[PDB]
Amino acid sequence: KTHVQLSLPVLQVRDVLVRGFGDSVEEVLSEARQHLKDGTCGLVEVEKGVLPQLEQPYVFIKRSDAAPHGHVMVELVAELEGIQYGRSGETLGVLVPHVGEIPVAYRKVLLRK
């Protein structure tokens, strides 16, 4: 399927144990996609002070369209030293590995895969 319905655990930035997916734009997009498939991906909502507490390159989920079955359609955009790889809509948050942190909420998304 070109899209997959996912429910992403929303994590508080100070709880996150593994603060990024790797060391290159290509690696973080690769790893983000694998963790999304494996159900081991969390989401941190971006506010003042959040991104400096996470590791670059960043992987964002961005709204790709204006929401089947409650699921917002999203795609992945990476960012490294102020350059983004991908073009999409409004940021829903930054993806990180989930290794058992307790979430505050879930974010229903339809991921373009």
Curated annotation (Swiss-Prot):
Entry coiled-coil feature ranges: none
Localization in the cell: Host cytoplasm
CoV Nsp1 globular domain span: 2-113
Residue ranges, annotated region (Disordered): 1-113
Domain of life, per lineage: Viruses
Chain's role: Inhibits host translation by associating with the open head conformation of the 40S subunit. The C-terminus binds to and obstructs ribosomal mRNA entry tunnel. Thereby inhibits antiviral response triggered by innate immunity or interferons. The nsp1-40S ribosome complex further induces an endonucleolytic cleavage near the 5'UTR of host mRNAs, targeting them for degradation. This inhibits the integrated stress response (ISR) in the infected cell by preventing EIF2S1/eIF2-alpha phosphorylation upstream of stress granule formation and depletes host G3BP1.
Protein name: Host translation inhibitor nsp1
Organism of this sequence: Severe acute respiratory syndrome coronavirus 2
Portion of the parent chain present: 11 to 125 of 7096
